[PDB]
Amino acid sequence: QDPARSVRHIAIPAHRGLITDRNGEPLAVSTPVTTLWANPKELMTAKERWPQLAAALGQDTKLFADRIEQNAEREFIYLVRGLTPEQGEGVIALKVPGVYSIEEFRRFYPAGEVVAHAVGFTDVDDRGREGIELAFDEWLAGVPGKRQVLKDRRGRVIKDVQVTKNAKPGKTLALSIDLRLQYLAHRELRNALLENGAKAGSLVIMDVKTGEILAMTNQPTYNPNNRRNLQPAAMRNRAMIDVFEPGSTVKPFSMSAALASGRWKPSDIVDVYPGTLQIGRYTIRDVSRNSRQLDLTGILIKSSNVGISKIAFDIGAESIYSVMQQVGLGQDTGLGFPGERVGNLPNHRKWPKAETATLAYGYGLSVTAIQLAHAYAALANDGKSVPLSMTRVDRVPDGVQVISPEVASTVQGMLQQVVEAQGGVFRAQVPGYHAAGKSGTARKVSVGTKGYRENAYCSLFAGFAPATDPRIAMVVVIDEPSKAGYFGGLVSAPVFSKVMAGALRLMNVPPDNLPTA
Template sequence: MKLDGALYPWRFRLVIVLLLGMVAVISWRIVDLHVFDHDFLKAHGDARSVRHIPIPAHRGLITDRNGEPLAVSTPVTTVWANPKELAAARQHWPALAVALGQDPQVLSQKLGQNAEREFLYLARGLTPEQGEAVLALKIPGVYSLEEFRRFYPAGEVTAHLIGFTDVDDRGREGVELAFDQWLAGVPGSRQVLKDRRGHLIKDVGVARNAKPGKALALSIDLRLQYLASRELRNALVENKAKAGSLVILDVQTGEVLAIANQPTYNPNNRRNLQPAAMRNRAMIDVFEPGSTVKPISMLAALESGRWKPSDTVEVYPHSLRIGRFTIRDVSRGGGPVLDLAGILIRSSNVGISKIAFDIGGESIYRVMQQVGLGQDTGLGFPGEQVGNLPNHRKWPQAETATLSYGYGLSVTAIQLAHAYATIANNGRLVPLSLARLDQPANSTQVVPDEVARTVQGMLQQVTEAPGGVYRAQVPGYHVAGKSGTARKTSAGSKGYQQNAYRSLFAGFAPTNNPRLAAVVVIDEPGGEGYYGGLVSAPVFSKVMGGALRLMNIAPDNLPPLPEAQPAATLSGNGGRG
């Protein structure tokens, strides 16, 4: 083309070339998008119409050691709304409120405050029938989601151990929290097509399958759990006590067979839940164990080699002055001199203190540490306390004496039960477990076998000898144990409360082949008595007796069968006369 009269013909040609170049680029891009890079348009189209709806995954089942369900997930319906859409159907709001079981005025105010949002929960955790009733109204802007809600068949009996989940099905207390990663499932997703108004056009299919959580079998035996909970509750009522805890362990495997606490709560209905009722006192509350640690001090004495079971200690006049402190015996029976078993039977503070002075506080501290007092149990339970086992470079007499009879240290009920299980297991420490074990864990010999067996015999005498804790006896079985009574410390100040005690009993059975160890703690009994042998020992007797029978453990203390009497010989008169 010839440009006559053009001052700058090259400019015109440049514009023509640029325009042709742009047309070529646009044409190539159109061909590229439709032929080569068609995923780009598809992705943008899907972004405007394809949606992924989550598929909830239910949590794993929690069972007891025998397969009885302790926590299950049940399907529930969650109703949600798009307030922008629902605003156009204001005439349906009263009917919607009735179907949801809510106050119409409250619902109207809620929708008005969130009018600019596109998502709002209306109700969560409805039964499928309730959800269907709401959706049957066919109100524009009202939709539903399928979720799962945790249900606890044993209710308050296992509440402190199992814990609970929140509204989003995440563990918040107890085993539900401790094993949350194991129990929680992985949600899936379903691909759907929606129009610009959010209406469902097509269900494309499952994009990712939901993975349910893993099942968890606990070491708990639900039969023993019911037994422990019932007897502990009855004991609190009978003794007008403030609270209580009870622990049962398998001596040979270290499995926790029951943990009961009072007061308790219903995890299926937590509307009026009091925070104090949520504490798993057996693992969280620490206390001075009192005379229940005297057998551990006796272990230290025998292990030192300086004392033999036949050795005696003069306890008269049943008091001992140390500086400005005076140690006294509550029971003054048994005479002025006691052997080692007599010290435990009479629970002599003076006798065990004199032994402690001879072997030293360090020896007692070491044995207490070896049997698990003041140590982490390894259970990993949320909020579990370690307690306090004091140690001194140089042990003064006062601290040595108080440690030997259970003051100046703090433990939990499960730590104390672990220590007695170690004595019952012939001095072998087995790690504790809340999960059912197919094979027992490896044990560690922390106390010489012969020493542990000797103390087992002494503790059997505590329950069977005259003047012993006869209320702890179990018909048909030899049992061993020790009672304790400890004054409660004052919160926020030094010293002890007036007329506030913890009554304790710790023991195991059957003595010839120990299988179960148990600890009973009654907090602030308000009845006629507060001594451990009077308050806690009867609870131990009932629970241990029931547990031994439920576990089909053979009796070892049955009375001998009567000898067969020879048949009467008939007289020669035909039996007359």
């Protein structure tokens, strides 16, 4: 009986779609590779050739011979996947019976580590594994073809009957990222990390008018063309997967809820003396404690938890929760890519006072840097939230009004004072422009469950520019800076300054800090 003939179907591998940046710079490029395979049934008739084949493949003579012997009844085995066509030619040139070529594709990432977390990469089979490669795998992958062949009793092809399905290439995908801004960001987050002996960080740049991610970089990073060094940590797209308590960076949202309540205007006053406020067993504390009356701007400039807490008791936590939720903090109303974390916004039917105050000044919730950037974009875009995109946006979808335009404009001008006023975050100033934002510094949650660590910090700055016609929102998050000065305004705000400056200049944004004309 046995088998004199077989009909089988072998794949025609398809060309995966080019990934570019928003200007057509290649970021992921399908590269011709040569996969060597062999038919053991045919190899078995030419043993005298095996040693020169094993040497060609960098394999021990005996272990190779053992492998072939052990698979003598099979018709297919991989020798090696993914060598260059030049190297596959070197093995093919030996003319060993039963050794064959498949012309395949494998990815190359020309920007390497610079954009590795955003682009992601493919597995051994050329299917998306992380990032864009995975999120847009159906678009990029295309469909492999199918060829019907006739085969004899030892797996040798007698004839190509027909192509049953044509291979169709995957489609080109242009990201929203500008590789020039991405590089700038990369380099400046890298430098600040090193300068501060920090463990990790992220930076996200968004177009506030289009919802586009113009840049997304994290440290540590890795070279996606050589993933031998293997370290899982370095592969984390922290901007999208690592949640943190945003601390004082959410105070502009609490303030938007105050302004919207009917009960507060910027020039109203809060008594924050003596810099602490007891709430049953918990004490709210400010870092600087030489204040009494502060106006609402001043509460943001000095970053008083007490002042923001007293506002929150007056307007109620529900209003603050609603703002945070509407801007996307702890919500799944972002990109929603595979692997992305949502974080968490605590909810209560009856908010106790401690939870009300902590929410208002940014603890008891957890958000990602992308969320925080998107929230800042909505504030900067006169309270309108344009849907997030990682792909180039030619037709901008409709924004949703999440904060009233007047409230958003009032809070903008407060955040510009936070940067520009005496006692403010002067290091966030952007030469040429008016900039606006908010610093944050949060003690990290103690690892073995519990509470907080007195040694370890997350250093934040979030903002936008130009303050008077906003274009760009940006978040800089630096995890465990290790020097004397660890405050957001020392650590993160200068990175904001430099990367915002570069980005506005790259985008030809006209200066708006000009003598009053």
